[PDB]
Amino acid sequence: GKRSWDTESVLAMWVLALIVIFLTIAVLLALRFCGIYGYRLRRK
């Protein structure tokens, strides 16, 4: 149909969404792992 939908764009959007999910999750796991560590010695 050559309408426009270059699945490349659709393909591209799920890659960006997944990058965001990993970092989002990464931070919470690390925030907590470091949270129980008292890591946050930094609270000046």
From Swiss-Prot:
Protein origin, superkingdom: Eukaryota
Transmembrane segments: 15-31
PTM info: May be phosphorylated by LYN.
Domain notes: The WSXWS motif appears to be necessary for proper protein folding and thereby efficient intracellular transport and cell-surface receptor binding.
Function: Cell surface receptor that plays a role in immune response and controls the production and differentiation of hematopoietic progenitor cells into lineage-restricted cells. Acts by forming an heterodimeric receptor through interaction with different partners such as IL3RA, IL5RA or CSF2RA. In turn, participates in various signaling pathways including interleukin-3, interleukin-5 and granulocyte-macrophage colony-stimulating factor/CSF2 pathways.
Subunit annotation: Heterodimer of an alpha and a beta subunit. The beta subunit is common to the IL3, IL5 and GM-CSF receptors. The signaling GM-CSF receptor complex is a dodecamer of two head-to-head hexamers of two alpha, two beta, and two ligand subunits. Interacts with TMEM102; this interaction occurs preferentially in the absence of CSF2. Interacts with FCER1G; this interaction is direct. Interacts with LYN. Interacts with JAK1.
Implicated disorder: Pulmonary surfactant metabolism dysfunction 5: A rare lung disorder due to impaired surfactant homeostasis. It is characterized by alveolar filling with floccular material that stains positive using the periodic acid-Schiff method and is derived from surfactant phospholipids and protein components. Excessive lipoproteins accumulation in the alveoli results in severe respiratory distress.
Protein name: Cytokine receptor common subunit beta
Organism, as annotated: Homo sapiens
Range within the parent protein: 432 to 473 of 897
